[PDB]
């Protein structure tokens, strides 16, 4: 049970069954997924990215560690990923609004997480009422490393698909930031470096459209990535 793809080893762990690597994979997943979103939606120019291989069959641009502006974002995303180790991260999302600080989003790329108790088969309860993303992910079973690779490949191709064919062009002016939510288990003291505490998150207008990007199921974690937008079709 290992991922033997020669390209996969550069960005990702070869084994994702154990909790430490399961969590670290999730961290890397977040990095590559939001990299694809930021580049393919053209929120950031190509110069902020480095061309990479996810596998032998798929290439993807990822946030450049050698550029200051892009390194900041990557670090911030990595801080969020580290929260998956103890299970303190419910959701991390890129939120696009007309104006900075707006509650209501024009477009959202959301990744939502669920956690498993020791053994990686029993889903830990996640509530506000059952979290909307809990059920689909909880039903999921870890089907080995290559399924995880294929899941990652699906998500990347999906992000490319949505941006090229489905999503209408963004407005001339907008503001984009990252907004997250903690789990219930998360201590009050614990805080993800790079994110200021807030009692507000984001909201979507009632006629919002959606599209499933893909789901991830390593050994001891689960996640679902979705696109919420006013600019579909």
């Amino acid at each position: 049970d290992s991922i033997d793809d020669k390209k996969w080893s550069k960005l990702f762990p070869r084994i994702v069954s154990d909790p430490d690597r399961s969590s670290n994979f999730m961290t890397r997943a977040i990095y590559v997924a939001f990299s694809a979103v930021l580049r393919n939606r053209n929120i950031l120019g190509q110069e902020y990215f480095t061309k990479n291989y996810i596998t032998e069959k798929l290439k993807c641009m990822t946030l450049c560690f050698r550029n200051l502006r892009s390194n900041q974002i990557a670090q911030l995303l990595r801080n969020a990923g580290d929260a998956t180790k103890d299970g303190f991260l419910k959701e991390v999302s890129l939120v696009i609004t007309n104006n900075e600080g707006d509650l209501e989003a024009i477009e959202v790329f959301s990744m939502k997480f669920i956690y498993f108790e020791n053994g990686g088969v029993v889903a830990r309860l996640s509530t506000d009422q059952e979290d909307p993303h809990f059920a689909k992910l909880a039903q999921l079973v870890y089907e080995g490393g290559d399924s995880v690779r294929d899941q990652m490949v699906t998500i990347v191709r999906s992000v490319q698909f949505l941006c090229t064919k489905v999503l209408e062009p963004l407005p001339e002016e907008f503001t984009a930031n990252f907004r997250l939510e903690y789990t219930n288990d998360a201590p009050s003291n614990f805080r993800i470096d790079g994110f200021e505490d807030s009692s507000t998150f984001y909201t979507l207008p009632d006629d919002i459209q959606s599209a499933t990007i893909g789901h991830l199921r390593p050994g001891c974690h689960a996640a679902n990535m979705e696109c919420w937008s006013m600019l579909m079709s």
Binding site: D128, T175, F178, E181
Partner: peptide, 13 residues
């Protein structure tokens, strides 16, 4: 209940 907002942001004008 509890949320976090990135100090970093991206602006288009």
């Amino acid at each position: 209940a509890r949320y976090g907002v990135s100090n970093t942001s991206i602006n288009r004008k």
